[PDB]
Amino acid sequence: VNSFSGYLKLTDNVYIKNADIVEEAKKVKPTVVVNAANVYLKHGGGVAGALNKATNNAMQVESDDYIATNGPLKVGGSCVLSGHNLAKHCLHVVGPNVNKGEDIQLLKSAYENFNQHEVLLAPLLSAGIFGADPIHSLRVCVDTVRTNVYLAVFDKNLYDKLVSSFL
Ligand SMILES: Nc1cnccc1C(=O)O
C-alpha cells in the first residue's frame, strides 16, 4: 500500500491522475519525483520551472553545482539529486525536445531511467513544452517502465483524452 490517492489504474504498474504535480509532490512527499529536465538542468519553464519555483530556487542552485562538477546530462539520461521540500529525491530525466530536433526514439531510453526506482511520481516525458505527442509518451511509458509510476497530467482536457484513447 502507498499514499497516492485518486489515480486511475491503466496497467499492473502505471497509474494516472489529473493533479498539479507540484501540489501532488507537496501532499504525498514521494520517495522520488521526476523532473522534466534538460541537459543543462536549467529549470526555466514547464515542470522544471514549476518544481524549481516550489523549492524557492534551491533546485537550481543544487543543479548549477552538479553541472559545474559533472557537465551536461545526455538526452535520454538522468541524475538523482535532492527532492528539497517536495520529495526525498528528484530524478532529473531528459526526454528528447522535439522543438530542438532530438530523436524521439530517445524517449524509450529516457523512461528506462524510471526502472531504477521502485515507485515514482512523474510527468509524461517530452510532453507539452518538450513538444512530443503526449499519447505517444504514455504508450512508451507503459511499454518501458516496469516499476510503479504515478503520472500527473496537467491539462484536464489532455488527461481525459489520454484516458479515453488508452489501449
Ligand atoms: N503535469 C504538469 C504539472 N505541472 C506543470 C506542468 C505539467 C506538465 O506536464 O506540463
Side-chain angles (χ1 to χ4, degrees), residues 4 21-22 25 30-37 41 43 46-52 59 77-83 86-95 110-117 119-126 141 145 147-152:
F4 289 104
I21 188 171
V22 184
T31 306
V32 181
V33 65
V34 174
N35 181 33
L41 301 179
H43 309 304
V47 172
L51 290 170
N52 175 62
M59 177 181 284
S78 70
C79 68
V80 179
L81 290 173
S82 180
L86 304 178
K88 186 171 195 289
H89 304 286
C90 179
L91 180 70
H92 295 272
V93 180
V94 185
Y111 273 115
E112 288 170 342
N113 298 288
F114 289 24
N115 290 320
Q116 299 295 317
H117 302 278
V119 183
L120 315 87
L121 170 63
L124 285 168
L125 283 186
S126 298
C141 180
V145 180
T147 58
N148 293 323
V149 56
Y150 288 86
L151 294 169

Side-chain angles (χ1 to χ4, degrees), residues 97-117:
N97 191 326
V98 176
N99 305 316
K100 303 178 175 175
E102 297 168 349
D103 171 19
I104 195 59
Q105 299 303 139
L106 286 169
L107 186 54
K108 187 171 183 76
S109 301
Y111 273 115
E112 288 170 342
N113 298 288
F114 289 24
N115 290 320
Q116 299 295 317
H117 302 278

Side-chain angles (χ1 to χ4, degrees), residues 19-21 46-47 50 123 152-154:
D20 201 9
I21 188 171
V47 172
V153 152
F154 183 81

